[PDB]
Amino acid sequence: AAKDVKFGNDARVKMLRGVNVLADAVKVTLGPKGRNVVLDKSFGAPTITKDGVSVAREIELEDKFENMGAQMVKEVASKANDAAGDGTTTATVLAQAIITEGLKAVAAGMNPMDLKRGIDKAVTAAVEELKALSVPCSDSKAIAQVGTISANSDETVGKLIAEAMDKVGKEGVITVEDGTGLQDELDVVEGMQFDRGYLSPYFINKPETGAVELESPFILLADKKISNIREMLPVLEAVAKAGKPLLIIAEDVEGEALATLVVNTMRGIVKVAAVKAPGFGDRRKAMLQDIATLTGGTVISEEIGMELEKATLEDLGQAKRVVINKDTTTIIDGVGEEAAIQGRVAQIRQQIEEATSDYDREKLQERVAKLAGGVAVIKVGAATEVEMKEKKARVEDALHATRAAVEEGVVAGGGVALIRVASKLADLRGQNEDQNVGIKVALRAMEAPLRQIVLNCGEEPSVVANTVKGGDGNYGYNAATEEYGNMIDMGILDPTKVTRSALQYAASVAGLMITTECMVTDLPK
Amino acid sequence: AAKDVKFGNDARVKMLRGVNVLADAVKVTLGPKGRNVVLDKSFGAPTITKDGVSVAREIELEDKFENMGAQMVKEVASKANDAAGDGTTTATVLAQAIITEGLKAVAAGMNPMDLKRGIDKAVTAAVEELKALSVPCSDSKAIAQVGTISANSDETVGKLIAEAMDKVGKEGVITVEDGTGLQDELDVVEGMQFDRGYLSPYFINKPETGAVELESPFILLADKKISNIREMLPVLEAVAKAGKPLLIIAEDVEGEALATLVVNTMRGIVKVAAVKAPGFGDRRKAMLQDIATLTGGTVISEEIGMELEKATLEDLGQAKRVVINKDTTTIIDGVGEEAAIQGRVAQIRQQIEEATSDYDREKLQERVAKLAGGVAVIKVGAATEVEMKEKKARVEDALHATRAAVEEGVVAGGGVALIRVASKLADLRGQNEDQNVGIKVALRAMEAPLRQIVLNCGEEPSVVANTVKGGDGNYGYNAATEEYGNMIDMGILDPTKVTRSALQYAASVAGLMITTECMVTDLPK
Amino acid sequence: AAKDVKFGNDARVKMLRGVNVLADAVKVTLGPKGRNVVLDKSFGAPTITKDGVSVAREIELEDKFENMGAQMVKEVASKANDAAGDGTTTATVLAQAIITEGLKAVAAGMNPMDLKRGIDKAVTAAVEELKALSVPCSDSKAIAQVGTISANSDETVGKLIAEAMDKVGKEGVITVEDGTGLQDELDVVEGMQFDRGYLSPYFINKPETGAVELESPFILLADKKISNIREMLPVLEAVAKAGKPLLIIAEDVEGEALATLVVNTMRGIVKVAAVKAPGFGDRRKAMLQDIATLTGGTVISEEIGMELEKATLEDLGQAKRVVINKDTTTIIDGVGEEAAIQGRVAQIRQQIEEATSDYDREKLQERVAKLAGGVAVIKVGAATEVEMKEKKARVEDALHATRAAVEEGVVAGGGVALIRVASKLADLRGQNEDQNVGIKVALRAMEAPLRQIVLNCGEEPSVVANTVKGGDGNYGYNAATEEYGNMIDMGILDPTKVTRSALQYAASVAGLMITTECMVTDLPK
């Protein structure tokens, strides 16, 4: 239909209004003293939550332009959350501060491209400063500490994360499930982990997790793109008779094919979910063969000759359980014989020995690593199902935070790491006046999270900010206890990775929006 | 239904407002320092882009008259894109400048036809002056240079374009695909390319490319029009059972058959692409025989006697991959035996020997050229799939720019070539005062692109324009570094063909536009 | 009546709109190619003028806040005019530029007081740099040159100013007159001048000059305030019988007395002008005795004993002609005997000999100087009354410019002196970022006059500004001839004093205005 176009500073102020609305809605909940926010369920009582991620997905304004601004800020914040596992609120607050200041400066006839360049310089300097200020978390003791801190100060979950961490090594895979007994159970079972996302969000059987958990699902290996529904109709009938969930790994899925699969899942006849083919080319085929070895399945490739129509239940693989995250996959306890898997590992090891190319050697090494390391299994243990659910969620978020900390490090939490890098970078200068102004905008905008936390605590924001900036190291302001001191000592910690990613994505979206004039928009009807 | 008509200068100002909206929307993104622009999306986050083609595609105004003005300018800009491969933003900016000045002069009580004649004289003089200012790009070194600078200064892609260029000669065919390994692969396989477009846009399986990529498709050769789908039923059943893509080269395809094939493609049971049969008469039949030789198919003609109902899978040809551009096609690695192709080449060579007409001789010579030259195949090589996609896009645009440069030449980029032509043609005079005023309008409107680029950079436009006009040769203003110098030395180059086509099409649409009075359109409801 | 206020940035934008209206109205007429502007006349035809003073006189806006902004700028510009004699348009343009930029910066959350301090520092540096760039005008040849160019390039009037300047010395007094013959006349008579303005603007018998010219008036010397009109009744009757004008010098004039004299001028039975008594205390009494000596009058003081009621026509002084400027007075050819004046000069000379205080010695020396030097009178000579009036106006503005140049100096005109100062002060830095931004605002605002002059000429402003900044010395851009070169050589000159005063007053009003929040005003009814 027709499209109203608004360009100039009117577009900028409308977009700023949208970002202001979304940023207020999110920043209210920031901090340990974060205030509650009430959503609206279509039916029944409204839900009340302090979670920035849950509230953020709800807001989308009425008038279209500010809706666009809010939507893209929300999308970048969600990208930040997916990258690390937290920091949606921090990213949104940083984006709001940077954008308010930057658009205020742009309204003063200042070169927006220079503002973007200065902000980029400031944020990269802040990122390397954070890396300098990072504290290693390789030792198991700090791993237990961060696990405890993430899960609302519970030592048992941090301990469990520590033993699983030891079991599956530094870059291991850890999955969480429900255990029958009150005691927590840990064991390692051979299983896969590759980074691919579901074809459609509608496959999500558990929307509150955003994942597809299947119990004893058959698996179909395909090196070919599924084009016609007739190709996998016989296996669809076979699995429907079997009355079990299905998993489809294929080179590609066409639009009509995935539409038909979505319709079938809505029918509920078969609990089938599909995911893209990982790997690439020959590497893709080799690791598909690895999956077949693991699950006892068989790869169906056009080049070899067989077709999906000639698919039997025996030809398919199987596993005890699988989970399809947003951009991750997990296979647990493949049926395939361990001796065959060890033989495949030996074959790939010989390939490593004869490997001459460096990147192919890296691919083979990580392939054998994921093939032999397996998948850690953590089973939550308590008395009541309410504590099952809440402790499972706590274990989930603690595991995310702990792996993020292990990957990069851990800095002082509560938003004071940003304050520290800002104070460290007080003399950073750009190539000219405009870049310098952008640098100063970024520097004074990185103070927004601590100021908002203090404001939620009810104390004076600027006083606490000045007191923190006066100190050096990791000295900061405990929001919960309202006492000063070394944040690491009192346990308030955030992974270096989450803060770095949140700041980087906030700066990226800020620079990407500061330099926009035109907006095409559907007519308000 | 009823149609509101508006004529006189009120129609002209309506048209000017529409063109102003579209031109602002597009020109905001012009130049290396081009400002971003956010676009519509009915669902999810809005997309952010600096490519003016998408912005133009996503523009249409609420008011009907503004909409018609914007739409005709957009159509001419799209024609400019199709001609060369770039320069939509430049064409739109030139059109906006010429339209503003010319409509202003027409409102100043001046003969519009004389303005059009003066603009045409000025633009043809500019075109020949630009051809004089062109720099040849025949040598492989300049080919590598243009390929490198086109793809954001990547030497590897320009190099690869250079080797493919050497492989398939001056007027060879270049195609891009995805390579399994990190190394780039190049090889020549007998193929084809003829200038024909898809019957409808709906065949586009990949809208972001505007093409129809099919893997291992069967081809049906037909010298007749597709009047009834009954003839298409047996082959459709055969290809549905085969479960492979289909291609249809026919003399014509009626609208009802087009609707049937559109419905079939939307169903997804069978994917099929149709395209007009090029050549003409006897030449058309001869090149269809060539296609049959290459693909191992058979030509089905009413005159010979066989009908499309009596068509088997063996009768159809086959190839490893095909792509249907907007107005072009490509066939890669025809199954047909190379000895048969060589025999056909020898037959057409004898036809060349006995050829008497110069035109028939040229047709036969280009026929043997396109038959024996084959098709170059370039496979992108890297690790990640994300970089597969981005480097494939870079290779595509670099190939387009490189072939455009080879066809005609390469001039100073950054919009300074138009400034140089303007300075060279400062004394061009028409037959009378009105033609002279039109000439001056065109001359001062050719400065719009550089002025807009400088304005996007934040510097003073007119100062830079005057400084550039002062110099001679290719001296100008580097936008990225903000340093004066020579564009040839600084690697900021644009093909002569794209600039010439953009300027010519802007002049053509401006001449058409100025000489309009009446605007018939449907009532606003 | 009730009053409404408005504070914050809304007040600033209201003031910005008002000053924008006034600045547009004034700046249109700037430069030699200044565009005309029509005025309003309640009766008869409108008057078309290029003089910015006249245009600014009638400007007052509908909205109260815009009216305040316009009135503040207009009052400061009028102060600039009174200080030097020209440069109202330059002051208004500078104020508009500085205010636009400063309020734009203040909207960016920037400390207004630091902006004021930075602007003050920048303008002080500019003033001292301008003094450094000043060219002396002491020699008679340069005096003739400035007089010639001031009066639209008429050598005769500049010559006449030169001879008068020689007659009455460097700090002499010169007064215009209408000479009967076509030949220009010059004479030296015993006169007087002191810096005092009329009590009421209503005394102005010639509003287009803003002065009070009286022929053969009877001066009355008084050392007392005119509390009651009864004291003025006998002298008023005497002068009514005499049927001649009169002058009144008194210690002070009360509101009732001046209201009564305004009534008596509206009746105009007596031609009366009253001016505040100059001098101070004993110095005032001594110089009033000097006035009595010059005019043959007598000082009437309460302390001595005589009263204003016991005043005869003989007691009053007399002179051939007097003129009361806005803030100055002139008395020409006092009737008093020259021998008595010489004796008084000698007496004050022996007072100088015994004068031990430095400032008292200065007062006595300037007193004898103004007593002995007298007033020179230049009489314009032509054939027609119309050319008499226009040449009289030319003599007025020419001698104003000449005395301004003699006082301080002469710099390059056409607004290029400010450009040169700006280029010289490109590296001036403040104490912090805010003061630096204010400094840059002032520096880029000093380019406004030349830019507006070029824009009125129809050429490109910024190109000319850049070309001028590139040069050094006095190399500017001739607006009239549109040729570059040295302003001094081509006689486009402005006094250093007028440029300095205009810039200083523009900076002062800009500082007073940027730091304004509250606007208390009467309600719009």
PDB file of C-alpha atoms in Angstrom, chain A residues 7 515-518, chain B residues 23-30 33-37 452 456:
ATOM      1  CA  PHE A   7      12.693  12.692   6.778  1.00  0.00           C
ATOM      2  CA  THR A 515      22.990   8.702  10.991  1.00  0.00           C
ATOM      3  CA  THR A 516      19.402   8.231   9.736  1.00  0.00           C
ATOM      4  CA  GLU A 517      17.242  10.915   8.127  1.00  0.00           C
ATOM      5  CA  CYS A 518      14.605   9.207   5.977  1.00  0.00           C
TER       6      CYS A 518
ATOM      7  CA  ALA B  23      14.880  12.005  -4.590  1.00  0.00           C
ATOM      8  CA  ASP B  24      15.425  13.038  -0.973  1.00  0.00           C
ATOM      9  CA  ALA B  25      14.788   9.462   0.150  1.00  0.00           C
ATOM     10  CA  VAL B  26      17.365   8.135  -2.313  1.00  0.00           C
ATOM     11  CA  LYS B  27      19.970  10.929  -2.244  1.00  0.00           C
ATOM     12  CA  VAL B  28      20.284  10.773   1.552  1.00  0.00           C
ATOM     13  CA  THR B  29      22.282   7.552   1.093  1.00  0.00           C
ATOM     14  CA  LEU B  30      24.543   8.823  -1.703  1.00  0.00           C
ATOM     15  CA  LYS B  33      29.551   8.883   3.898  1.00  0.00           C
ATOM     16  CA  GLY B  34      25.939   8.148   2.946  1.00  0.00           C
ATOM     17  CA  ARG B  35      23.486   8.339   5.823  1.00  0.00           C
ATOM     18  CA  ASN B  36      21.540   5.207   6.705  1.00  0.00           C
ATOM     19  CA  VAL B  37      17.793   4.888   6.145  1.00  0.00           C
ATOM     20  CA  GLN B 452      25.116  15.812  -2.532  1.00  0.00           C
ATOM     21  CA  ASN B 456      26.567  13.977   3.114  1.00  0.00           C
TER      22      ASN B 456
END
